[PDB]
Design a protein around this ligand. Structure first.
Ligand SMILES: [Fe+3]
Length: 317
Protein backbone atom coordinates (compact mmCIF):
# COMPACT_ATOMS: atom_id res chain seq x y z
CA UNK A 1 0.00 0.00 0.00
CA UNK A 2 1.17 3.55 0.91
CA UNK A 3 3.69 4.49 3.59
CA UNK A 4 1.64 6.05 6.39
CA UNK A 5 3.35 9.10 7.91
CA UNK A 6 2.43 10.28 11.38
CA UNK A 7 1.94 14.00 11.86
CA UNK A 8 2.02 15.55 15.36
CA UNK A 9 0.17 18.81 14.57
CA UNK A 10 -2.24 20.39 12.16
CA UNK A 11 0.29 22.28 10.02
CA UNK A 12 2.37 19.14 9.83
CA UNK A 13 -0.62 17.23 8.45
CA UNK A 14 -1.15 19.96 5.88
CA UNK A 15 2.39 19.61 4.66
CA UNK A 16 1.97 15.80 4.59
CA UNK A 17 -1.09 16.11 2.35
CA UNK A 18 0.93 18.41 0.11
CA UNK A 19 3.77 15.87 -0.02
CA UNK A 20 1.15 13.17 -0.97
CA UNK A 21 -0.26 15.37 -3.82
CA UNK A 22 3.26 16.21 -5.00
CA UNK A 23 4.47 12.60 -5.15
CA UNK A 24 1.29 11.70 -7.20
CA UNK A 25 1.89 14.53 -9.65
CA UNK A 26 5.46 13.43 -10.10
CA UNK A 27 4.44 9.73 -10.05
CA UNK A 28 6.70 8.70 -7.21
CA UNK A 29 6.13 6.20 -4.37
CA UNK A 30 2.97 6.89 -2.40
CA UNK A 31 2.75 8.45 1.01
CA UNK A 32 -0.40 8.99 3.16
CA UNK A 33 -0.90 10.91 6.39
CA UNK A 34 -2.02 10.33 9.92
CA UNK A 35 -2.63 13.06 12.49
CA UNK A 36 -1.73 12.47 16.21
CA UNK A 37 -1.01 15.03 18.90
CA UNK A 38 2.29 14.41 20.49
CA UNK A 39 5.21 12.28 19.54
CA UNK A 40 4.08 9.50 21.87
CA UNK A 41 0.72 9.23 20.13
CA UNK A 42 2.61 8.70 16.84
CA UNK A 43 4.91 6.16 18.59
CA UNK A 44 1.79 4.30 19.85
CA UNK A 45 0.11 4.36 16.38
CA UNK A 46 3.15 2.99 14.47
CA UNK A 47 3.37 0.23 17.08
CA UNK A 48 -0.26 -0.60 16.66
CA UNK A 49 -0.07 -0.51 12.78
CA UNK A 50 -2.00 2.76 12.27
CA UNK A 51 1.02 4.55 10.87
CA UNK A 52 4.37 3.37 9.67
CA UNK A 53 6.73 6.28 10.23
CA UNK A 54 7.68 9.46 12.01
CA UNK A 55 10.81 11.57 12.50
CA UNK A 56 12.00 11.92 16.13
CA UNK A 57 14.54 13.81 18.28
CA UNK A 58 17.12 11.63 20.12
CA UNK A 59 15.27 11.55 23.44
CA UNK A 60 12.08 10.16 21.90
CA UNK A 61 14.08 7.63 19.77
CA UNK A 62 15.10 6.19 23.14
CA UNK A 63 11.48 6.13 24.32
CA UNK A 64 10.11 4.61 21.07
CA UNK A 65 12.69 1.87 21.17
CA UNK A 66 11.42 0.61 24.54
CA UNK A 67 8.89 -2.02 25.37
CA UNK A 68 6.39 -2.32 24.36
CA UNK A 69 6.94 -0.15 21.27
CA UNK A 70 10.33 -1.47 20.09
CA UNK A 71 10.68 0.99 17.20
CA UNK A 72 14.02 1.37 15.49
CA UNK A 73 15.62 4.24 13.48
CA UNK A 74 15.72 3.83 9.68
CA UNK A 75 16.95 7.02 8.14
CA UNK A 76 18.95 9.80 9.84
CA UNK A 77 18.49 13.48 8.73
CA UNK A 78 21.60 14.92 7.10
CA UNK A 79 22.71 18.44 8.15
CA UNK A 80 25.50 20.77 7.19
CA UNK A 81 26.24 21.39 3.56
CA UNK A 82 26.58 19.35 0.44
CA UNK A 83 30.33 19.83 0.61
CA UNK A 84 30.55 19.28 4.43
CA UNK A 85 27.75 16.92 5.48
CA UNK A 86 27.13 15.38 8.83
CA UNK A 87 24.69 13.14 10.65
CA UNK A 88 25.19 14.85 13.94
CA UNK A 89 24.66 18.18 15.56
CA UNK A 90 25.75 19.99 18.64
CA UNK A 91 24.08 20.84 21.94
CA UNK A 92 25.02 24.41 22.91
CA UNK A 93 24.33 26.91 25.68
CA UNK A 94 23.58 30.34 24.32
CA UNK A 95 23.65 33.57 26.30
CA UNK A 96 23.83 37.28 25.73
CA UNK A 97 27.19 38.99 25.16
CA UNK A 98 28.16 41.22 28.05
CA UNK A 99 27.60 38.78 30.89
CA UNK A 100 30.07 37.37 33.28
CA UNK A 101 28.67 34.06 34.46
CA UNK A 102 29.81 30.67 33.40
CA UNK A 103 28.38 27.16 33.05
CA UNK A 104 29.28 26.45 36.59
CA UNK A 105 27.53 29.64 37.77
CA UNK A 106 23.94 28.96 36.69
CA UNK A 107 22.27 28.66 40.03
CA UNK A 108 19.22 30.83 40.45
CA UNK A 109 19.21 31.88 36.83
CA UNK A 110 16.41 31.88 34.26
CA UNK A 111 16.53 29.14 31.48
CA UNK A 112 14.99 28.40 28.06
CA UNK A 113 14.74 24.80 26.95
CA UNK A 114 13.46 23.40 23.63
CA UNK A 115 11.17 21.00 25.48
CA UNK A 116 11.07 18.34 28.11
CA UNK A 117 12.99 15.11 27.23
CA UNK A 118 14.45 16.53 24.10
CA UNK A 119 18.18 16.03 23.63
CA UNK A 120 19.93 19.39 23.43
CA UNK A 121 17.16 21.25 25.25
CA UNK A 122 16.96 18.94 28.23
CA UNK A 123 18.91 15.62 28.54
CA UNK A 124 22.17 17.16 27.63
CA UNK A 125 21.96 20.25 29.91
CA UNK A 126 20.50 18.32 32.87
CA UNK A 127 23.15 15.63 32.39
CA UNK A 128 25.88 18.28 32.40
CA UNK A 129 24.56 20.32 35.31
CA UNK A 130 23.97 17.23 37.50
CA UNK A 131 26.79 18.07 40.05
CA UNK A 132 25.19 21.37 41.00
CA UNK A 133 21.71 19.87 41.04
CA UNK A 134 22.00 18.20 44.43
CA UNK A 135 19.51 15.50 43.43
CA UNK A 136 18.68 13.46 46.51
CA UNK A 137 16.11 11.57 44.49
CA UNK A 138 14.60 9.21 43.57
CA UNK A 139 11.74 9.02 44.74
CA UNK A 140 12.13 12.74 43.98
CA UNK A 141 11.82 13.49 40.29
CA UNK A 142 14.53 15.10 38.22
CA UNK A 143 12.22 18.03 37.30
CA UNK A 144 11.87 18.86 41.02
CA UNK A 145 15.65 19.34 41.38
CA UNK A 146 15.82 21.46 38.23
CA UNK A 147 12.92 23.60 39.53
CA UNK A 148 14.89 24.26 42.74
CA UNK A 149 18.12 25.11 40.70
CA UNK A 150 16.73 27.65 38.23
CA UNK A 151 14.62 30.58 39.39
CA UNK A 152 12.20 30.19 36.53
CA UNK A 153 12.29 28.38 33.25
CA UNK A 154 10.33 27.53 30.17
CA UNK A 155 10.38 23.79 29.63
CA UNK A 156 7.46 22.82 27.23
CA UNK A 157 5.68 19.72 28.19
CA UNK A 158 6.61 19.90 31.89
CA UNK A 159 3.88 19.57 34.49
CA UNK A 160 2.86 23.07 35.59
CA UNK A 161 0.74 21.45 38.35
CA UNK A 162 3.66 19.75 40.14
CA UNK A 163 6.45 21.95 38.93
CA UNK A 164 5.21 25.49 38.36
CA UNK A 165 8.63 27.24 37.92
CA UNK A 166 9.55 25.22 34.81
CA UNK A 167 6.61 26.69 32.80
CA UNK A 168 6.82 30.11 34.54
CA UNK A 169 8.68 31.75 31.67
CA UNK A 170 6.58 30.08 28.97
CA UNK A 171 4.87 32.36 26.54
CA UNK A 172 1.74 30.45 25.37
CA UNK A 173 -1.80 31.65 25.95
CA UNK A 174 -4.00 29.93 28.55
CA UNK A 175 -3.91 26.14 28.44
CA UNK A 176 -1.18 26.41 25.69
CA UNK A 177 1.26 27.95 28.16
CA UNK A 178 3.99 25.34 28.65
CA UNK A 179 2.64 23.25 25.77
CA UNK A 180 4.75 20.83 23.82
CA UNK A 181 3.60 22.16 20.43
CA UNK A 182 3.84 25.28 18.26
CA UNK A 183 1.01 26.94 20.19
CA UNK A 184 3.60 27.63 22.94
CA UNK A 185 5.87 30.18 21.26
CA UNK A 186 9.01 29.16 23.19
CA UNK A 187 8.80 25.57 22.00
CA UNK A 188 11.68 23.93 20.13
CA UNK A 189 15.03 25.37 19.01
CA UNK A 190 13.72 28.69 17.73
CA UNK A 191 11.30 29.16 20.57
CA UNK A 192 13.96 28.60 23.16
CA UNK A 193 16.25 30.99 21.32
CA UNK A 194 13.42 33.56 21.11
CA UNK A 195 12.96 33.29 24.95
CA UNK A 196 16.63 34.26 25.21
CA UNK A 197 16.21 37.21 22.68
CA UNK A 198 12.96 38.37 24.43
CA UNK A 199 14.86 38.63 27.65
CA UNK A 200 12.86 36.18 29.65
CA UNK A 201 15.76 33.79 30.17
CA UNK A 202 19.52 34.20 30.62
CA UNK A 203 20.47 30.94 28.84
CA UNK A 204 18.99 28.85 26.02
CA UNK A 205 19.88 25.18 25.48
CA UNK A 206 19.71 24.50 21.80
CA UNK A 207 21.71 23.35 18.79
CA UNK A 208 24.51 25.10 16.96
CA UNK A 209 22.56 26.30 13.95
CA UNK A 210 19.58 28.08 15.46
CA UNK A 211 21.36 31.38 15.80
CA UNK A 212 22.57 31.28 12.20
CA UNK A 213 19.17 30.35 10.92
CA UNK A 214 17.37 32.92 13.06
CA UNK A 215 19.74 35.88 12.88
CA UNK A 216 20.67 36.53 9.27
CA UNK A 217 22.46 39.75 10.17
CA UNK A 218 25.96 39.07 11.35
CA UNK A 219 25.99 42.10 13.62
CA UNK A 220 22.85 40.93 15.39
CA UNK A 221 24.67 37.60 15.78
CA UNK A 222 27.53 39.29 17.63
CA UNK A 223 25.30 40.07 20.67
CA UNK A 224 25.42 36.36 21.70
CA UNK A 225 28.16 34.01 22.67
CA UNK A 226 28.31 30.38 23.89
CA UNK A 227 28.94 29.03 27.36
CA UNK A 228 31.71 26.44 27.05
CA UNK A 229 32.45 23.44 29.27
CA UNK A 230 35.89 24.84 30.33
CA UNK A 231 33.90 27.64 31.84
CA UNK A 232 34.73 30.15 29.23
CA UNK A 233 32.52 32.13 26.94
CA UNK A 234 33.30 31.99 23.21
CA UNK A 235 31.59 33.29 20.03
CA UNK A 236 28.69 31.47 18.33
CA UNK A 237 30.70 30.29 15.38
CA UNK A 238 33.09 28.41 17.69
CA UNK A 239 30.59 25.59 18.47
CA UNK A 240 33.02 22.82 17.54
CA UNK A 241 35.30 24.10 20.29
CA UNK A 242 32.46 25.13 22.60
CA UNK A 243 29.60 22.61 22.99
CA UNK A 244 27.99 20.49 25.64
CA UNK A 245 27.72 17.33 23.57
CA UNK A 246 27.89 16.13 19.99
CA UNK A 247 24.54 14.51 19.33
CA UNK A 248 23.38 12.28 16.42
CA UNK A 249 20.58 13.50 14.14
CA UNK A 250 16.93 13.29 14.33
CA UNK A 251 15.63 10.13 12.83
CA UNK A 252 12.80 8.43 11.19
CA UNK A 253 11.65 5.46 13.11
CA UNK A 254 9.65 2.39 12.05
CA UNK A 255 8.75 -1.01 13.59
CA UNK A 256 11.42 -3.59 14.17
CA UNK A 257 9.23 -6.36 12.84
CA UNK A 258 7.36 -5.64 9.56
CA UNK A 259 8.19 -2.02 9.59
CA UNK A 260 8.26 -1.35 5.74
CA UNK A 261 11.93 -0.16 6.01
CA UNK A 262 12.69 -0.48 2.33
CA UNK A 263 9.37 1.10 1.38
CA UNK A 264 10.14 3.92 3.77
CA UNK A 265 13.64 4.22 2.37
CA UNK A 266 12.58 4.36 -1.26
CA UNK A 267 10.00 7.06 -0.36
CA UNK A 268 12.59 9.22 1.41
CA UNK A 269 15.26 8.65 -1.20
CA UNK A 270 12.86 9.50 -3.99
CA UNK A 271 11.44 12.51 -2.07
CA UNK A 272 14.91 13.91 -1.54
CA UNK A 273 15.62 13.73 -5.31
CA UNK A 274 12.47 15.35 -6.48
CA UNK A 275 11.59 17.61 -3.63
CA UNK A 276 14.91 18.23 -1.92
CA UNK A 277 17.09 21.28 -1.28
CA UNK A 278 16.60 23.40 -4.41
CA UNK A 279 15.02 20.47 -6.35
CA UNK A 280 11.60 21.95 -6.90
CA UNK A 281 9.79 25.28 -6.90
CA UNK A 282 6.52 23.52 -6.09
CA UNK A 283 7.40 21.53 -3.01
CA UNK A 284 10.18 21.76 -0.47
CA UNK A 285 10.57 18.69 1.81
CA UNK A 286 12.99 20.56 4.06
CA UNK A 287 11.00 23.66 4.46
CA UNK A 288 8.10 25.10 6.46
CA UNK A 289 5.83 28.05 5.66
CA UNK A 290 5.18 31.37 7.42
CA UNK A 291 4.64 30.94 11.22
CA UNK A 292 5.84 27.35 11.16
CA UNK A 293 9.24 25.75 11.61
CA UNK A 294 10.44 22.17 11.25
CA UNK A 295 7.26 20.60 9.96
CA UNK A 296 7.88 16.77 9.68
CA UNK A 297 11.58 17.09 9.15
CA UNK A 298 14.03 19.88 10.25
CA UNK A 299 13.99 22.88 7.83
CA UNK A 300 17.81 23.01 7.40
CA UNK A 301 18.23 19.33 6.52
CA UNK A 302 19.64 18.42 3.19
CA UNK A 303 18.95 14.73 3.01
CA UNK A 304 18.79 11.34 4.63
CA UNK A 305 21.15 8.61 5.37
CA UNK A 306 20.06 5.00 5.76
CA UNK A 307 20.65 3.67 9.17
CA UNK A 308 22.14 0.20 8.97
CA UNK A 309 20.41 -3.09 9.73
CA UNK A 310 20.46 -4.41 13.32
CA UNK A 311 21.36 -0.98 14.61
CA UNK A 312 19.51 -0.48 17.88
CA UNK A 313 17.86 2.68 19.09
CA UNK A 314 20.32 2.59 22.03
CA UNK A 315 23.22 1.70 19.75
CA UNK A 316 22.30 4.52 17.24
CA UNK A 317 22.23 6.98 20.23
FE1 LIG B 1 17.10 17.80 18.90
Amino acid sequence: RSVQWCAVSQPEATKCFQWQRNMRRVRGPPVSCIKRDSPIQCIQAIAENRADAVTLDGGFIYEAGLAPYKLRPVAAEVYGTERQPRTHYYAVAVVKKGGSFQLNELQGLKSCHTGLRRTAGWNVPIGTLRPFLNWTGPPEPIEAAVARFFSASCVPGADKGQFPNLCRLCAGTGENKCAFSSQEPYFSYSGAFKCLRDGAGDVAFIRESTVFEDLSDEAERDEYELLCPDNTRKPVDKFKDCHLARVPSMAVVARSVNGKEDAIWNLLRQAQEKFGKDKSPKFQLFGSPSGQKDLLFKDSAIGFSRVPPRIDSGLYL
